[PDB]
C-alpha cells in the first residue's frame, strides 16, 4: 500500500471462551541471506563421514522457514497452567498466519565502517506448501521456532532437506527440489501476507493420569467363578505329583483372569542419576537399544511410550527413552546432568510396562517327568489383542504436531516424541542485504472439560510458595528469560 | 519462647459491653504474622 | 472469572503426591471421614 502506512498491528493474547481457547502470538523476526543466494549440495564426506550410521546426502537452500511447532510459542506458562489443571484434553482446530511490517535493510561496508539503510524497492518472497510437495522438516524437533518470550527477537532458520544415499554418494533415485519452481508471492514494505489453515480431525491428547491400575480393576470384595491350578504336588517326597484347584479371589489378586493386558514394550537399558551405581565402562552407544534400517543402526530414541521407572525409583531413567531438554544457556556438547532437564513418563505406569523391565515370562519347553518347567524373559513384546496403552505426554517445551509419513500402512500413527500425528499438518555479485518484520500466528484449540466425581482434591500444577532470587518463568537481572522445568500436561485423574 | 505465666485471658485483647469484657475474637482482619515468620500467631487473631 | 494477564504460573491448592496410610479428605479403615487441614480461598492474585 505505502511506505509510511503500517500493514498490521501487534496481536498477542489468549482468549478462553466455552470449550475453546484461541491463542495469538506475534514475534519480530530477522531473515539474513543464506548460502549467498545459492543451492549447495551437502554430504557427510565434507565433514569426514567416519561413521556409516551418520552418513547422509542432501541439499541446502537459501530459503528460511517459520516454525511455530513448539507449545511454548502459543502458550504462556500461566495459560499452560490454566489448561492442564482444568481439562482432560485438548487439540488444535484452526490456524491463521499473518506476515506484515516488512523492513528490508542494505548494509554497505566501506573501508572499516558499515552503514545500514532502508532499501525500499526490494521485495521478499514467501510461499507455503499446501500440497506437501517439499520434504517436511518440521516434525523432527528442530530449533528456530518462535521464542517463548514475546519480547525476544529471533532469527529464521535455514531450510534444507535430505534424500536417498549410499555412503556419501547419491543414488539414481535421489530427488532434487528447487523452491523457485513453486509459485510464490513477493512483498514490499507495504505489502502483507496471510493464509488460514484447517486442522484435520485428531483425537484429544489426554491430559490426565489414571487413578486405577490395569491389574487392580477387580472388585476387592468378591471371588471369581473361574479356577486356577494352585498346587501341582502333595508335598516333599517321590511320586507326589497331583493337581489341585482353588478359587481366584481377593486373597490372591495376581492370578485372576483379566480381560486386558498392558501395552507393548521394547526394553531400554537402565541408567541411574547416581553415577557410582553405574558400571565403569563406556556404554552410551554400545549398550543402547537400537533399530537397524538398510544397514544403519539408529538409536531407539525415545521409542514406544513406557513408564520411565518403577514406583519409588526416581533416580533411574531409560537410556534413550525420555525427552531431555536443556536449561537456559546450556552448552551444546558434553554438559553435566544438572544442565539438562530429563522428563519422565511416570504417570502412564498404570497401563504401560516399565521401560527398563521385561514384559513378562513365557514357557520355553514342555514340562515332563524328566524335565522341569522352564521359562524365559520377554525383552520386547509387539501388539497383542487386548492391549491398552497410553501415548507420550506433551510438554510446554515439547512439539505440537508431526507429519504421518505417507506409506502403505502404519499402526497408531501418533508420533513417539509426543503430540498430534497428522497426514496434512500445518551473476555472483550481490548487495549485502537482509529483511525483518512481524509474524502473527493464531491457533484455535478445543477443550475437554473434567467431569470427574472424585471427592478429594486433585493434584494440581502450582508455583512454589517460597522466596527465591528470581521469579520462575521470568527474566533475570541481565534480561534473560528462562524456563526452570519441563511441564507435563497430566495432573487430573480418571478411572481406568 | 513464651512467657512463663498464664496470659491467655489476662494478656488478651478484649472489648467491654454493659460492664462485661468480651474477648476480641477474631476481630478486625489483620495479617497473622510478618512475611518470613512461621512460628508466631495472634492470641485471639485467627479462627481455630 | 480470572481475567489476569500475569505471565508466570499462579499458586494453586494441590493434593500432595507421596505415599501415606490414607488419602486426605477421605475415610480411614474404621469409617471415619476426617478433614486434615483448613483450605483458604486465596490462591490466585490481582494487582492492587
Amino acid at each position, epitope marked *: 500500500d505505502g511506505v509510511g502506512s503500517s500493514s498490521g498491528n501487534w496481536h498477542c493474547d489468549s482468549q478462553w471462551l466455552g470449550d475453546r481457547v484461541i491463542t495469538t502470538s506475534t514475534r519480530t523476526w530477522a531473515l539474513p541471506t543464506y548460502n549467498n543466494h545459492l543451492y549447495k549440495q551437502i554430504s557427510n564426506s565434507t565433514s569426514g563421514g567416519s561413521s556409516n550410521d551418520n552418513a547422509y546426502f542432501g541439499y541446502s537452500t537459501p530459503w528460511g522457514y517459520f516454525d511455530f511447532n513448539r507449545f511454548h510459542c502459543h502458550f504462556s506458562p500461566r495459560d499452560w497452567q490454566r489448561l492442564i489443571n482444568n481439562n482432560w484434553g485438548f487439540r488444535p482446530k484452526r490456524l491463521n498466519f499473518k506476515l506484515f511490517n516488512i523492513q528490508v535493510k542494505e548494509v554497505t561496508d566501506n573501508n572499516g565502517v558499515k552503514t545500514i539503510a532502508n532499501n525500499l524497492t526490494s521485495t521478499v518472497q514467501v510461499f507455503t506448501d499446501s500440497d506437501y510437495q517439499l520434504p517436511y522438516v518440521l516434525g523432527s524437533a528442530h530449533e528456530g521456532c518462535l521464542p517463548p518470550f514475546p519480547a525476544d527477537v529471533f532469527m529464521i532458520p535455514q531450510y534444507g532437506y535430505l534424500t536417498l544415499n549410499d555412503g556419501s554418494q547419491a543414488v539414481g533415485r535421489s530427488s532434487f527440489y528447487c523452491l523457485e519452481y513453486f509459485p510464490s508471492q513477493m512483498l514490499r514494505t507495504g505489502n502483507n501476507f496471510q493464509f488460514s489453515y484447517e486442522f484435520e480431525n485428531v483425537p484429544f491428547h489426554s491430559s490426565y493420569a489414571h487413578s486405577q491400575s490395569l491389574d487392580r480393576l477387580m472388585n476387592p470384595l468378591i471371588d471369581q467363578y473361574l479356577y486356577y491350578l494352585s498346587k501341582t504336588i502333595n508335598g516333599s517326597g517321590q511320586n507326589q505329583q497331583t493337581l489341585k484347584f482353588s478359587v481366584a479371589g481377593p486373597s490372591n489378586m495376581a492370578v485372576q483372569g483379566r480381560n486386558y493386558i498392558p501395552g507393548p514394550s521394547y526394553r531400554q537399558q537402565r541408567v541411574s542419576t547416581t553415577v557410582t551405581q553405574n558400571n565403569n565402562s563406556e556404554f552410551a552407544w554400545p549398550g543402547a537399544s537400537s533399530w537397524a534400517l538398510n544397514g544403519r543402526n539408529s538409536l531407539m530414541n525415545p521409542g514406544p511410550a513406557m513408564a520411565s521407572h518403577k514406583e519409588g525409583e526416581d533416580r533411574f531413567f531409560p537410556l534413550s527413552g525420555s525427552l531431555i531438554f536443556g536449561k537456559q544457556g546450556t552448552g551444546r556438547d558434553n554438559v553435566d546432568a544438572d544442565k539438562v532437564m530429563i522428563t519422565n513418563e511416570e504417570e502412564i505406569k498404570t497401563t504401560n510396562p516399565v521401560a527398563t523391565e521385561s514384559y513378562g515370562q513365557v514357557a520355553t519347553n514342555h514340562q515332563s517327568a524328566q524335565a522341569q518347567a522352564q521359562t524365559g524373559w520377554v525383552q520386547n513384546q509387539g501388539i497383542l489383542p487386548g492391549m491398552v496403552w497410553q501415548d507420550r505426554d506433551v510438554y510446554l517445551q515439547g512439539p505440537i504436531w508431526a507429519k504421518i509419513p505417507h506409506t502403505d500402512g502404519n499402526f497408531h500413527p501418533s508420533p513417539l516424541m509426543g503430540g498430534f500425528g497428522m497426514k496434512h499438518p500445518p551473476l555472483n555479485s550481490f548487495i549485502t542485504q537482509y529483511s525483518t518484520g512481524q509474524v502473527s500466528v493464531e491457533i484455535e484449540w478445543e477443550l475437554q472439560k473434567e467431569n470427574s466425581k472424585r471427592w478429594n482434591p486433585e493434584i494440581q500444577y502450582t508455583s512454589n510458595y517460597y522466596k*527465591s532470587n528470581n521469579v520462575e518463568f521470568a527474566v533475570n537481572t541481565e534480561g534473560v528469560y528462562s524456563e526452570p522445568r519441563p511441564i507435563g500436561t497430566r495432573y487430573l485423574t480418571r478411572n481406568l | 519462647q513464651n512467657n512463663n505465666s498464664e496470659f491467655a485471658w489476662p494478656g488478651a485483647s478484649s472489648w467491654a459491653l454493659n460492664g462485661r469484657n468480651s474477648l476480641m475474637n477474631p476481630g478486625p482482619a489483620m495479617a497473622s504474622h510478618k512475611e518470613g515468620e512461621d*512460628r508466631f500467631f495472634p492470641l485471639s487473631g485467627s479462627l481455630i | 472469572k480470572e481475567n489476569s494477564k500475569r505471565w508466570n504460573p499462579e499458586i494453586q491448592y494441590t493434593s*500432595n503426591y*507421596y505415599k501415606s496410610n490414607n488419602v486426605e479428605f477421605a475415610v480411614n479403615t474404621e469409617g471415619v471421614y476426617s478433614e486434615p487441614r483448613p483450605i483458604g480461598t486465596r490462591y490466585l492474585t490481582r494487582n492492587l
Partner: antibody, heavy 131, light 110 residues
C-alpha cells in the same frame, strides 16, 4: 527409596577454622519439611545439633553448638546448609542430614514439637577437627 | 537427656524390651520416636508418634509410652534384629531441643 539426601563439604579441619556442609535433597517437596543436622561422635550416641523450619524463618540449635554454628536452607536449590565456625576437636563426628517427616504448609504454622521428627536420614560425612 | 540401658540381650524367638526414662519436659509431654541403627549405617525409623510405625517395618516392633517412660518391645527376636537402639523425643526445656537417648545395643545370644 524415593527420598534421597546427600552431604558434601566434610573434611579435616584444624581447630579455630570454619567449614561449610551441604545436603542435596531430592524425591520430596523440600520447602515443606523442616530439616535438621544430627552428629554422631565416634563410639558415641546420636546428638541433634540443629533444625530449621520449611520456610527457614525459625531455627533451633543445641546448646553445645550454639553461636558457632548456623543452619540455613535454600529452598530454590533444595539444599540444607550448615556453616560451622570456631571449630574444635570436640566436633569430630559423622554429620547426618535428616529430613523432617511431618508435612506442613503456609495454611498452618511451624510447630517445633511435631515437625522435627525425622523419617529418613543421609549417609553422612565424617568431619575431623585435629591439629 | 533420655536414659537407656547400655545393652540388652535376647534369644531368637523371645521378646525383648528396651526402655527409656525421661523428664516431664520430653517423654512426658511429647511424642517418642525409636531409631534402629547398625554401625556404619545411617539410622532407620522404627516407631514414631509413640506407638505408630512406618511402612516397611515388621509387625513385631511395638512401642508404647506411659507417663515419663517409653518402652520398645521386640517379639520374635532375630539375628538381624541385633543393633543399637536410640530413643528420641522433643524437649521443651533449655530452648527446645530434639534429644536422643544414650543408646542400647541389643545382642542376640545363641
Amino acid at each position: 527409596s524415593e527420598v534421597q539426601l546427600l552431604e558434601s563439604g566434610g573434611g579435616l579441619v584444624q581447630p579455630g577454622k570454619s567449614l561449610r556442609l551441604s545436603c542435596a535433597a531430592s524425591g520430596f517437596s523440600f520447602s515443606n519439611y523442616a530439616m535438621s543436622w544430627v552428629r554422631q561422635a565416634p563410639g558415641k550416641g546420636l546428638e541433634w545439633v540443629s533444625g530449621i523450619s520449611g520456610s527457614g524463618g525459625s531455627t533451633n540449635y543445641a546448646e553445645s553448638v550454639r553461636g558457632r554454628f548456623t543452619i540455613s536452607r535454600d529452598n530454590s536449590k533444595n539444599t540444607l546448609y550448615l556453616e560451622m565456625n570456631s571449630l574444635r576437636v570436640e566436633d569430630t563426628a559423622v554429620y547426618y542430614c535428616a529430613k523432617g517427616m511431618s508435612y506442613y504448609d503456609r495454611s498452618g504454622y511451624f510447630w517445633a514439637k511435631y515437625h522435627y521428627g525425622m523419617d529418613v536420614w543421609g549417609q553422612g560425612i565424617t568431619v575431623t577437627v585435629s591439629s | 537427656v533420655l536414659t537407656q540401658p547400655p545393652s540388652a540381650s535376647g534369644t531368637p524367638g523371645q521378646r525383648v524390651t528396651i526402655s527409656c526414662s525421661g523428664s516431664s519436659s520430653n517423654i512426658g509431654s511429647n511424642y517418642v520416636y525409636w531409631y534402629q541403627q547398625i554401625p556404619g549405617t545411617a539410622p532407620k525409623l522404627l516407631i514414631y508418634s509413640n506407638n505408630q510405625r512406618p511402612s516397611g517395618v515388621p509387625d513385631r516392633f511395638s512401642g508404647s509410652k506411659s507417663g515419663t517412660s517409653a518402652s520398645l518391645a521386640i517379639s520374635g527376636l532375630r539375628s538381624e534384629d541385633e543393633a543399637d537402639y536410640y530413643c528420641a523425643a522433643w524437649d521443651d526445656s533449655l530452648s527446645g531441643n530434639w534429644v536422643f537417648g544414650g543408646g542400647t545395643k541389643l545382642t542376640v545370644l545363641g
